[PDB]
Scaffold this motif. Sequence first.
Motif, short mmCIF file in Angstrom:
data_model
loop_
_atom_site.label_atom_id
_atom_site.label_comp_id
_atom_site.label_asym_id
_atom_site.label_seq_id
_atom_site.Cartn_x
_atom_site.Cartn_y
_atom_site.Cartn_z
N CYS A 4 -22.07 -19.00 46.54
CA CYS A 4 -21.29 -20.48 45.49
C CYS A 4 -20.77 -22.06 45.84
O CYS A 4 -20.60 -21.92 44.72
CB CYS A 4 -20.81 -19.22 43.86
SG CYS A 4 -21.22 -18.49 43.78
N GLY A 5 -21.20 -21.61 47.24
CA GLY A 5 -20.69 -23.15 48.11
C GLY A 5 -18.98 -22.59 47.41
O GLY A 5 -18.27 -24.01 47.80
N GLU A 6 -18.11 -21.62 47.97
CA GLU A 6 -16.74 -21.39 48.21
C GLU A 6 -16.90 -20.34 49.33
O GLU A 6 -16.75 -19.17 49.05
CB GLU A 6 -16.68 -21.40 46.95
CG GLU A 6 -14.62 -21.22 46.29
CD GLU A 6 -13.96 -21.17 44.86
OE1 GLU A 6 -13.11 -21.07 45.27
OE2 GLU A 6 -14.58 -20.72 44.62
N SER A 7 -15.68 -21.19 50.07
CA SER A 7 -15.12 -20.17 50.75
C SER A 7 -13.90 -18.73 50.32
O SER A 7 -13.35 -19.40 49.91
CB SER A 7 -14.76 -20.79 52.37
OG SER A 7 -13.84 -20.23 53.78
N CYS A 8 -13.62 -17.79 50.67
CA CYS A 8 -12.62 -17.56 50.32
C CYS A 8 -12.12 -16.35 52.09
O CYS A 8 -11.64 -15.14 51.68
CB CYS A 8 -13.17 -15.82 49.59
SG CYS A 8 -14.18 -15.12 49.74
N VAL A 9 -12.59 -16.68 52.78
CA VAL A 9 -11.41 -17.25 53.99
C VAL A 9 -10.20 -16.54 53.97
O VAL A 9 -9.34 -15.97 53.86
CB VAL A 9 -11.66 -17.86 55.10
CG1 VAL A 9 -10.64 -17.46 56.22
CG2 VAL A 9 -13.05 -17.49 55.98
N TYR A 10 -9.78 -17.85 52.76
CA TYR A 10 -8.06 -17.38 53.03
C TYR A 10 -7.88 -17.05 51.11
O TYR A 10 -6.97 -16.22 50.62
CB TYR A 10 -7.41 -18.58 52.96
CG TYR A 10 -5.76 -18.34 52.77
CD1 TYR A 10 -5.02 -18.06 53.75
CD2 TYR A 10 -5.35 -19.30 51.49
CE1 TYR A 10 -3.57 -17.61 53.82
CE2 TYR A 10 -3.90 -18.78 51.76
CZ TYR A 10 -3.50 -18.22 52.84
OH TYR A 10 -2.17 -18.11 52.40
N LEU A 11 -8.19 -18.62 50.54
CA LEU A 11 -8.31 -18.38 49.39
C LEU A 11 -8.88 -17.81 48.47
O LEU A 11 -10.42 -17.32 49.17
CB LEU A 11 -8.73 -20.03 48.76
CG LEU A 11 -7.92 -21.21 49.38
CD1 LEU A 11 -7.58 -22.86 49.08
CD2 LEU A 11 -5.96 -20.39 48.24
N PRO A 12 -8.94 -17.27 46.99
CA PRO A 12 -9.81 -16.80 46.28
C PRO A 12 -10.98 -17.41 45.72
O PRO A 12 -11.35 -18.25 45.88
CB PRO A 12 -9.37 -16.29 45.18
CG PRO A 12 -8.29 -16.92 45.04
CD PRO A 12 -7.46 -17.63 46.43
N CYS A 13 -11.72 -16.81 44.84
CA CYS A 13 -13.09 -16.93 44.64
C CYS A 13 -12.76 -17.81 43.36
O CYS A 13 -12.85 -17.36 42.15
CB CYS A 13 -14.53 -17.16 44.12
SG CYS A 13 -14.82 -16.49 45.77
N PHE A 14 -12.35 -18.72 43.18
CA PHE A 14 -11.96 -19.85 41.61
C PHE A 14 -13.45 -20.59 40.95
O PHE A 14 -13.66 -20.60 40.03
CB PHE A 14 -11.28 -21.21 41.57
CG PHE A 14 -10.44 -21.31 42.34
CD1 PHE A 14 -8.95 -20.48 41.70
CD2 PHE A 14 -9.82 -21.08 43.96
CE1 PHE A 14 -7.54 -20.00 42.12
CE2 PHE A 14 -8.26 -20.51 43.88
CZ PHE A 14 -7.66 -20.38 43.25
N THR A 15 -15.03 -19.48 41.88
CA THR A 15 -16.80 -20.38 41.66
C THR A 15 -16.41 -18.29 40.43
O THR A 15 -17.57 -18.44 39.83
CB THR A 15 -17.12 -20.25 42.51
OG1 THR A 15 -17.16 -19.51 42.95
CG2 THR A 15 -17.33 -22.14 42.87
#
Length: 30
Positions: A4-15
């Motif tokens: 989805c074009g979003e890292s969740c290394v730290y943050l959650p997936c707002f996608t």
Amino acid sequence: GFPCGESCVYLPCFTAAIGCSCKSKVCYKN
């Protein structure tokens, strides 16, 4: 199965707003 074009290394997936979830540090959907 598709990123989805979003890292969740730290943050959650707002996608999550378009159905994505964190799968081992990458936001993914189907």
